[PDB]
Design a binder for this molecule. Structure first.
Ligand SMILES: CCCCCCCCCCCCCCCCCC(=O)OC[C@H](COP(=O)([O-])OCC(O)COP(=O)([O-])OC[C@@H](COC(=O)CCCCCCCCCCCCCCCCC)OC(=O)CCCCCCCCCCCCCCCCC)OC(=O)CCCCCCCCCCCCCCCCC
Ligand SMILES: CCCCCCCCCCCCCCCCCC(=O)OC[C@H](COP(=O)([O-])OCC(O)COP(=O)([O-])OC[C@@H](COC(=O)CCCCCCCCCCCCCCCCC)OC(=O)CCCCCCCCCCCCCCCCC)OC(=O)CCCCCCCCCCCCCCCCC
Ligand SMILES: CCCCCCCCCCCCCCCCCC(=O)OC[C@H](COP(=O)([O-])OCC(O)COP(=O)([O-])OC[C@@H](COC(=O)CCCCCCCCCCCCCCCCC)OC(=O)CCCCCCCCCCCCCCCCC)OC(=O)CCCCCCCCCCCCCCCCC
Ligand SMILES: CCCCCCCCCCCCCCCCCC(=O)OC[C@H](COP(=O)([O-])OCC(O)COP(=O)([O-])OC[C@@H](COC(=O)CCCCCCCCCCCCCCCCC)OC(=O)CCCCCCCCCCCCCCCCC)OC(=O)CCCCCCCCCCCCCCCCC
Ligand code: HEA
Ligand code: HEA
Ligand SMILES: CCCCCCCC/C=C\CCCCCCCC(=O)OC[C@H](COP(=O)(O)OCCN)OC(=O)CCCCCCC/C=C\CCCCCCCC
Ligand SMILES: CCCCCCCC/C=C\CCCCCCCC(=O)OC[C@H](COP(=O)(O)OCCN)OC(=O)CCCCCCC/C=C\CCCCCCCC
Ligand SMILES: [O-][O-]
Ligand SMILES: [Cu+2]
Ligand SMILES: [K+]
Ligand SMILES: [Zn+2]
Ligand SMILES: [Zn+2]
Ligand SMILES: [Zn+2]
Lengths: 107, 196, 121, 459, 62, 120, 52, 65, 226
């Protein structure tokens, strides 16, 4: 069963005595129904919808990396509402292993 | 080892220069293979015959230059000069000198991160380890609490079930006394109504 | 008992009261709940407790009611549904006075047993 | 275009749209039934038009099963998300997907047209001979609808099976749920077609299979050999939805994924070999009865494992997250409701108990709690979860605690009393009844009118 | 065939130009009513080829 | 505070039932005559000619997008060279107030927490 | 290759379209029949279907 | 095109003509009528009344109405 | 690749009837201005002209020899691009498995657009977690919320175009000395004499330079019936 990543005590040792757990808000913000402008036409309302996607949002950490909107299933990865053609570039499921080959390295 | 040994694409030769396998309907022309073997000589026999590539001798000096500049390539070029290179030898030469394309990570543009942010990498990793430590411990804590609680449900379901056991128990006692003592039980009482 | 015996890196509150605080709340207003049990304006942060000063990992707990009404609020500072009350105040009390906890639980179970047995029988 | 579209997501919307439309006719028939059963006497159907009631109950059952819940849970949600869950661009067979929905609509038009034009008589949704074969042409029309529906179901099953060849990710539990239902259809439908053809032969080709020296019990074997696999073809997609909703909304990874998957496979195999629990009162041999009773009770084991794995998904979830969303409430309500339906199923599984409870309203309440409550709520919960992805609006459902509460209360007012009258006893498929059963029938009728009123508040 | 067994056609011998073959804007006016009937009949060559191969055996059975 | 009052101005109440005048007062069924809008109706919806009567999937208005070199127009990233390194600045979505309306302030705090897993 | 302006000024000055007016539960009961009997595109499509 | 990105773009962008919704509801309403109209027709055909009067197939008191 | 179907006949060579009839202009067109068919026949005519001249091969440098055959001398820029192209193509029908990504070496996610859907499965063994799907947009260093695996998007973009073998060849290959038609004629007479054609491509090519129909048997070769 999965119980999280394994931690060695050495990795829990801080580099400063004042280090605490970063208090970054992971609430993306306040939202509601997407509100279109009357002036916008069909094309410009499409752009508006594409700019309100929660799955394109993320939270930036103190070191500049961002934790993205994540989901257990790929159903939450398409634009909402679903466009006619979704996964043009095949979504990549990344598997990890310990195998390596020499060609990838240089001395 | 694919398609029964039949090559998907292969060369065929015809002796008559104006021959067309689709327009003509003659029955004397015999097609040849890429090496020139007539079709009436079976594959099992022709494949045993040794065929070697013969280049014009004017190419020998070029093939010699190739061997000297690349010594690993010399044995194959020597076979070609001496007319000892079969198709298999050519294939071995071809695949021996094929190399994979190289990707350089140093040429990849990086997502923008300020120097202040780059100095906090160790801190963020430190936070991540403590989050994984707290996650793993909580799993044990929660598993113990809730699976223990489920026992309260077993006991509550055993108490409520026992209430119906007692009702059923009393029901059976009552039933045993109906035909024996109950005045509600009457015999020689119901008389046939008869047809209307 | 997570803070007491399992994990020593989370802030541990002080019990202000082993009973919920009853308060009238209004929709559209934001309330701040004391998570350390040392505020003198319970159940709210008073501006002088640990939560107000952001000391020792204590922070005010934001809360907002959907509708107006009277709501129960946690005094033990450990209820699972904090700031709201769900009975954790009694549970935490039993941990601190296990003999008393048994008395109440026996009495509650005794009443439940009598009523359910009397009606079904 | 509208009818020419091959987009798998558009077709999924069509399936839901058509299920709601046809569903209006289904609910109306249900209201007729409950109105009639409000007291003893004739209320809305004349005593000389009792054949209409027999037709109402027959069409109600057939439409709700084959034209509403099956097109909604096996055609609607599946065609919209399955190709996305499989990280594939579109469904494997685009043109087949288009014709399947068109076929469903055409078979629906045939059925309703047969109401209007043919004499109205009924033989139940189980079309038992010899009654089914001595009827009028409306029975012939209904047979054509079922056969046509069967074509759409099988080709759709072929479509989903081909996802195994193209799936570019991991087969999630929901994908496993649809694949197994597809397998159940591929194995059960061909048997149904055969027995339906024999019904036609006796109706239209002067065949004699269902007259003396021919065993009428033969039909019941072949029919129910498809019948019970059908009830799991209708519930398994619902189980798949419940798994996704609980994991997503609680932010918890599915626990025992492989046991969930192997529980679905197990239910299918067992569901393919227990059909004769519908034929307990015919007079089968003692050993046959014992075999079927034994295997029927076994189905509870895999079904029970799934229920408990769902419970732990909801346990321990963060309190800060708002739990009043309609999708979450419906998913939780499914566990509470399905256990009631399943337990009563185990009660009726005991054949000796079944002698008393066969062809009584206890059976009705049993399969309503699972389908009319559980399956409906599962389809609603699934659509609600995909509201943003689907994009529909102009309804007040997403956060409506009144709708959920009123629906739960009133739906139970309808069918809980039907368990009581099962020991009264009130037979099924009847309109008139003794005056001493009015109270419970009246209470259920009050429940039916109320549920309909609550359906208007969503708009 | 325009598949593995063959390949493309040299431009010297292409006779159905896609630019003219497609762009059906107002094609009915260009072909007229008799042309429309001709095009419909010519669209069913595949079905005609089948019926020419299928009918004879059925005549024999009849 | 009332967040609706922040974006009340953007929401001007409507005049027509279903947002359209009677077809007599304005014919929204006709195709727009505006240059560059030949594929749209007057009210902004796609015209039946563009989508049905002369749909490109049926062979109308044949126009291959790919060029001779097998290329199509692609918009590049926002590149910013700095500190002896070529960087790419990602596109951040606009403030949710612009798209949704509510002012992004007083957001409740939901901390990062790794998945709630069962242990032991 | 086509050149288009950033914007176009229409010849008329009629604001025909915009946000919906607030509607009640039974607004459809009068608006729908109004469209059928008063909007040309609706009653020309009905007559065409019935006639043929 | 941007207009073609979303399936049913007019509806999703909230510009669709309301008549489409009206037709959908009308279609559902017609479907419902297939259960009520034949009920009335069949009742009249075999009885002469479109709908019965509660308990008119049983013996009624003199003052019953 | 495993996802590709069977080689066509064209994948090996093109029919001589697809040779452009204006050979004189073909051999003078810059590489950036040559289409796929024109580029095929430019390389074949020029490459076979040098290969069918044995006496000059030993004195020709590999740089010049590669240019004549149309082969691109490799360098780190072009190797990087070609490699990432072939990696993109491989991932079209193959699994995505590799070492755990870190800040020093993020998981490289090739894409043509500005976004590609990616799933993190965690580490190996017990460090593997359930698929967590996220949208990998350019310009952000992504970190999995569960295992802290670092991801990064790599875009195959160059000057309003994506990366293709044709683009790489055009951007980095430099046209050499203009091809001399005298070489074509000289080699033509070498291998084609007295009704024997041992350079068919050079017999057709010389015929076109002469104006089409000039050489023996070529009018009959160009006369077709359908
Ligand atoms: C001393 C008090 C108890 C006295 C009695 C004791 C009797 C002995 C029991 C065993 C020993 C108990 C020892 C406990 C010591 C404390 C241990 C501990 O850890 O303490 C802290 C711990 C809590 O601490 P915490 O977690 O830190 O947080 C504090 C919170 O308070 C968090 O609290 P919580 O979450 O734990 O809250 C408890 C809550 C947790 O649970 C829930 O809230 C779940 C509620 C889900 C409801 C879902 C909707 C259901 C609607 C169904 C409608 C169906 C209609 C149609 C039916 C058709 C039928 C044909 O429990 C309930 O609500 C009770 C649910 C019980 C089952 C309900 C179903 C009954 C069915 C009856 C038969 C029906 C037959 C017909 C149907 C068909 C049959 C096949 O306290 C407890 O464990 C308390 C447990 C209390 C149980 C009370 C049960 C009363 C109800 C009985 C059944 C109803 C009928 C009765 C007549
Ligand atoms: C002497 C004689 C000798 C011998 C002669 C022998 C001759 C042999 C002839 C053999 C061939 C004959 C047949 C030829 C068929 C040709 C098909 C073809 O190629 O068409 C191309 C043709 C392409 O058209 P186009 O020329 O490009 O332009 C079309 C227009 O621009 C329109 O553009 P569009 O296509 O985008 O618009 C379509 C769409 C536009 O959308 C709308 O109207 C609004 C949006 C939808 C509103 C909400 C509707 C309800 C929700 C439905 C959800 C499921 C939808 C599933 C998908 C659609 C399925 C139909 O609306 C519709 O037209 C139908 C919408 C759905 C209607 C049904 C909904 C359920 C109602 C239930 C009511 C009762 C309960 O196809 C069509 O567009 C029309 C096809 C019509 C087929 C009708 C078949 C009906 C069968 C009914 C049952 C029959 C038995 C009982 C009947 C009883 C009657 C009393
Ligand atoms: C084989 C194979 O190569 O399969 C993959 C292969 C596709 O190649 P691929 O690219 O490796 O697929 C990627 C994976 O799909 C992606 O899979 P993954 O990598 O995410 O997961 C690994 C593994 C995940 O899957 C597994 O490892 C599952 C393996 C166990 C499956 C359940 C077996 C049955 C339950 C146990 C029975 C025990 C009986 C004991 C009797 C004892 C008597 C003494 O993958 C597979 O096994 C994929 C294939 C699953 C095929 C399922 C076929 C239907 C199963 C029906 C079960 C029984 C239903 C009973 C209904 C009622 C009957 C009365 O499958 C096909 O070619 C599909 C053909 C479909 C034809 C359907 C029509 C048949 C007529
Ligand atoms: C269970 C219920 C409760 C459920 C509650 C829970 C629900 C939860 C949420 C579920 C959400 C599911 C997913 C939704 C996705 C929506 C996607 C969407 O909107 O797609 C866009 C799609 C189309 O939008 P678009 O892209 O703009 O399409 C443009 C068109 O393609 C092109 O535009 P066009 O204008 O060119 O269109 C052509 C148009 C042209 O139209 C016109 O010209 C119309 C002219 C006016 C005619 C009006 C009707 C007249 C009737 C007269 C009757 C006279 C009777 C006289 C009796 C006399 C007696 C004495 O139409 C036609 O030409 C063909 C129309 C054919 C369809 C209508 C058939 C009607 C019934 C016919 C029955 C015939 C029976 C014959 C029997 C014969 C026996 C012998 O939307 C729709 O089609 C409307 C959908 C609206 C509802 C969406 C769902 C909302 C949420 C649920 C609300 C509750 C609904 C409850 C069910 C209904 C209850 C009644
Ligand atoms: C989707 C709908 C559905 C579902 C899931 C089921 C599920 C079950 N049904 Fe079915 N049933 C119908 C729909 C359904 N049924 C219909 C529509 C009819 C009537 C058709 C007609 O006659 O016209 C019918 C009829 C029917 C009868 C006929 C009674 C009669 O004709 O007189 C019987 C009896 O064997 C039966 C049994 C079962 C059993 C034993 C299950 C099992 O699947 C239940 C399993 C679930 C549980 C057991 C609860 C969850 C598990 C646990 C909580 C574990 C712990 C429990 C135990 C250890 C027991 N059903
Ligand atoms: C899944 C199928 C289904 C559904 C939903 C229902 C729903 C209902 N049924 Fe059911 N019923 C059957 C299948 C179903 N029934 C079958 C198969 C029989 C036996 C047939 C026979 O005897 O021959 C039967 C028999 C039956 C009878 C027995 C009549 C008799 O034979 O004597 C009665 C009345 O007592 C009844 C009443 C109801 C009521 C009041 C509702 C509901 O109205 C209760 C209220 C619930 C709702 C109104 C919501 C329903 C909404 C939808 C279904 C649409 C969902 C669509 C989406 C979510 C997109 N039903
Ligand atoms: C799923 C595919 C496998 C299904 C296997 C089902 C077999 C169940 C066994 C049930 C059993 O014992 O059969 C008895 C039962 C009949 O019992 P009685 O009418 O009482 O007659 C007995 C003596 N006169 O047998 C049957 O009805 C068997 C029906 C044939 C099933 C054939 C399935 C074919 C699948 C392909
Ligand atoms: C009164 C009974 C209920 C009527 C009802 O709710 O009908 C709704 C339905 C859809 O209307 P809206 O939801 O307003 O859609 C237009 C765009 N917003 O209205 C109609 O179909 C109007 C005609 C109803 C005829 C019923 C017979
Ligand atoms: O049917 O269970
Ligand atoms: Cu069954
Ligand atoms: K009655
Ligand atoms: Zn405090
Ligand atoms: Zn408390
Ligand atoms: Zn991860």
């Amino acid at each position: 069963i999965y119980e999280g990543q394994t931690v060695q005590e050495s990795e829990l040792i801080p580099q400063e005595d004042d280090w605490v757990i970063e208090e970054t808000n992971f609430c993306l913000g306040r939202n509601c129904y997407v509100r279109f402008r009357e002036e916008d036409d069909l094309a410009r309302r499409a752009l508006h919808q594409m700019d309100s996607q929660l799955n394109k949002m993320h939270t930036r950490l103190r070191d500049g990396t961002v934790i993205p909107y994540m989901s257990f299933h790929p159903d939450e990865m398409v634009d909402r509402p679903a466009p006619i053609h979704t996964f043009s570039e095949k979504p990549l499921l990344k598997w990890t292993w310990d195998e390596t080959y020499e060609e990838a390295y240089d001395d | 080892a694919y398609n029964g040994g039949y090559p998907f694409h292969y060369v065929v030769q015809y002796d008559d220069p104006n021959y067309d396998c689709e327009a003509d309907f003659e029955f004397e022309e015999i097609p040849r293979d890429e090496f020139g073997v007539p079709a009436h000589i079976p594959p099992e026999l022709s494949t045993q015959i040794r065929h070697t590539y013969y280049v014009p001798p004017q190419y020998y000096p070029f093939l010699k230059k190739l061997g000297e500049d690349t010594p690993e390539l010399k044995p194959y070029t020597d076979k070609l000069i001496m007319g000892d290179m079969t198709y298999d030898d050519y294939e071995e030469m071809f695949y021996k000198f094929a190399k994979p394309l190289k990707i350089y990570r140093s040429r990849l543009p990086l997502p923008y991160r300020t120097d202040e942010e780059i100095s906090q990498e160790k801190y963020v990793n430190w936070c991540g380890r403590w989050y994984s430590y707290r996650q793993r411990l909580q799993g044990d804590y929660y598993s113990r609490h809730y699976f223990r609680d489920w026992l309260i449900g077993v006991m509550l379901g055993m108490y409520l079930g026992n209430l119906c056991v007692q009702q059923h128990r009393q029901y059976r006692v009552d039933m045993k006394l109906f035909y024996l003592e109950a005045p509600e039980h009457k015999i020689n009482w119901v008389k046939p109504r008869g047809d209307l | 008992t997570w803070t007491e015996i399992w994990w020593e890196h989370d802030p541990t509150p002080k019990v202000a009261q082993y009973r919920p605080y009853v308060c009238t709340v209004e929709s559209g207003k934001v309330y701040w709940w004391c998570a350390c049990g040392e505020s003198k304006t319970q159940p709210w942060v008073d501006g002088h407790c640990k939560c107000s000063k952001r000391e020792g990992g204590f922070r005010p707990r934001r809360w907002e009611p959907e509708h107006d009404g009277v709501r129960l609020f946690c005094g033990c500072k450990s209820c699972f549904s904090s700031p709201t009350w769900n009975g954790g105040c009694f549970t935490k009390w039993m941990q601190s006075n296990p003999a008393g906890g048994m008395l109440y639980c026996f009495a509650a179970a005794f009443g439940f047993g009598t009523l359910t047995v009397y009606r079904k029988f | 275009f509208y009818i020419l579209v091959n987009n798998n997501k558009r077709i999924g919307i069509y399936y839901i749209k058509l299920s709601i439309i046809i569903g209006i006719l289904g609910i109306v028939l249900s209201y007729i039934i409950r109105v009639e059963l409000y007291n003893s006497g004739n209320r809305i159907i004349k005593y000389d038009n009792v054949n209409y009631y027999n037709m109402v109950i027959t069409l109600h059952g057939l439409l709700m099963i084959f034209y509403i819940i099956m097109p909604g849970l096996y055609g609607g949600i599946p065609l919209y998300i399955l190709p996305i869950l499989s990280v594939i661009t579109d469904i494997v067979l685009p043109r087949i997907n288009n014709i399947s929905i068109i076929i469903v609509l055409i078979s629906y038009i045939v059925v309703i047209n047969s109401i209007v034009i043919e004499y109205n008589i009924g033989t139940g949704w189980t079309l038992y001979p010899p009654l089914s074969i001595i009827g009028t042409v409306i029975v012939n029309m209904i047979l054509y609808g079922l056969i046509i529906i069967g074509i759409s179901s099988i080709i759709s099953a072929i479509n989903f099976m081909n996802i195994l060849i193209v799936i570019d990710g991991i087969i999630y539990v929901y994908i496993w749920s649809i694949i197994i239902t597809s397998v159940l259809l591929i194995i059960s439908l061909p048997i149904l077609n055969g027995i339906l053809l024999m019904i036609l032969s006796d109706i239209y080709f002067n065949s004699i299979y269902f007259i003396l020296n021919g065993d009428v019990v033969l039909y019941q074997h072949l029919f129910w050999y498809f019948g019970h696999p059908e009830v799991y073809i209708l519930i398994l997609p619902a189980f798949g939805i419940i798994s996704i909703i609980l994991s997503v909304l609680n932010n918890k990874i599915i626990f025992g994924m492989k046991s969930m998957i192997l529980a679905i496979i197990m239910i299918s195999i067992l569901g393919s070999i227990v059909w004769a629990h519908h034929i307990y009162t015919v007079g089968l041999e003692l050993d046959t009865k014992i075999y079927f009773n034994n295997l029927t009770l076994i189905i509870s084991i895999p079904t029970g494992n799934k229920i408990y794995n769902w419970i732990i998904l909801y346990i321990g979830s963060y309190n800060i997250l708002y739990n009043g969303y309609q999708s979450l409430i419906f998913s939780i309500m499914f566990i509470i409701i399905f256990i009631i339906g399943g337990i009563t199923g185990i009660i009726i599984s005991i054949d000796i108990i079944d002698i008393g409870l066969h062809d009584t309203y206890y059976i009705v309440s049993h399969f309503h709690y699972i389908l009319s409550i559980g399956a409906v709520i599962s389809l609603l919960a699934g659509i609600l979860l995909l509201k943003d992805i689907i994009g529909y609006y102009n309804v007040i459902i997403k956060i409506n605690k009144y709708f959920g509460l009123l629906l739960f209360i009133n739906i139970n007012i309808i069918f809980t009393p039907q368990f009581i009258i099962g020991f009264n006893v009130m037979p099924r498929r009847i309109l008139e009844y003794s005056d001493n059963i009015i109270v419970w029938n009246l209470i259920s009728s009050i429940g039916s009118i109320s549920t309909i009123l609550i359906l208007l508040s969503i708009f | 065939w325009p598949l593995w067994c063959g390949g493309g056609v040299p431009d010297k011998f292409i006779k159905i130009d896609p630019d003219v073959h497609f762009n059906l804007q107002g094609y009915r006016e260009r072909i007229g009513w008799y042309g429309f009937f001709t095009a419909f009949l010519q669209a069913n060559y595949h079905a005609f080829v089948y019926f020419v191969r299928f009918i004879p055996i059925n005549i024999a059975i009849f | 505070k009332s967040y609706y009052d922040d974006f009340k101005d953007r929401l001007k109440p409507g005049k027509y039932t279903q947002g359209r005048c009677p077809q007599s007062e304005g014919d929204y069924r006709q195709e727009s005559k505006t240059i560059g809008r030949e594929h749209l109706n007057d009210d902004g919806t796609r015209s039946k000619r563009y989508t049905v009567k002369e749909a490109d999937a049926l062979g109308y208005h044949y126009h291959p997008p790919i060029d001779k070199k097998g290329q199509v127009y692609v918009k590049g990233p926002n590149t910013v060279i700095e500190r002896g390194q070529t960087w790419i600045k990602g596109y951040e979505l606009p403030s949710m107030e612009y798209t949704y309306g509510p002012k992004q302030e007083d957001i409740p705090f939901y901390p990062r927490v790794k998945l709630n897993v069962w242990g032991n | 290759g086509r050149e288009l302006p950033e914007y176009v000024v229409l010849p008329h000055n009629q604001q025909r379209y915009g946000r919906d007016k607030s509607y009640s539960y039974f607004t459809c009961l009068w608006h729908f029949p109004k469209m059928v009997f008063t909007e040309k595109w609706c009653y020309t499509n009905i007559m065409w279907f019935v006639f043929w | 095109n941007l207009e073609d990105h979303f399936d049913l773009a007019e509806y999703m962008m909230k510009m669709h003509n309301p008549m489409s919704e009206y037709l959908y509801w009308i279609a559902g309403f017609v479907s419902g009528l297939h259960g009520i109209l034949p009920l009335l027709h069949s009742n009249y055909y075999f009885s002469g009344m479109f709908l019965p009067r509660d308990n008119d197939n049983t013996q009624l008191c003199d003052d019953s109405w | 690749y495993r996802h590709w179907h069977r080689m066509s006949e064209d994948d090996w060579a093109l029919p001589l009837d697809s040779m452009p009839e204006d050979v004189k202009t073909l051999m003078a067109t810059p590489q950036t201005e040559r289409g796929f068919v024109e580029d095929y026949w430019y390389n074949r005519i020029r490459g076979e002209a040098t290969l069918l001249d044995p006496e000059a091969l030993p004195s020709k440098s590999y740089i010049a020899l590669a240019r004549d055959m149309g082969l691109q001398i490799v360098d780190e820029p072009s190797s990087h691009m070609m490699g990432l192209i072939e990696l993109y193509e491989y991932l079209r029908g193959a699994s995505f498995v590799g070492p755990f990504g870190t800040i020093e070496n993020p998981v490289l996610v090739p894409a043509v657009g500005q976004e590609r859907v990616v799933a993190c499965t965690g580490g190996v063994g017990d460090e593997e977690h359930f698929t967590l799907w996220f949208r990998c947009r350019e310009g952000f260093m992504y970190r999995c919320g569960e295992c802290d695996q670092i991801f990064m998007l790599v875009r195959l973009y160059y000057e309003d175009r994506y990366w293709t073998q044709t683009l790489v060849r055009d951007t980095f290959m430099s046209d050499g000395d203009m091809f001399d038609l005298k070489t074509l004629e000289r080699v033509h007479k070498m291998w084609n004499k007295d009704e024997m054609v041992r350079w068919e491509v050079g017999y057709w090519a010389q015929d076109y330079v002469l104006g089409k129909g000039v050489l023996p048997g070529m009018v009959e070769e160009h006369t077709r019936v359908n």
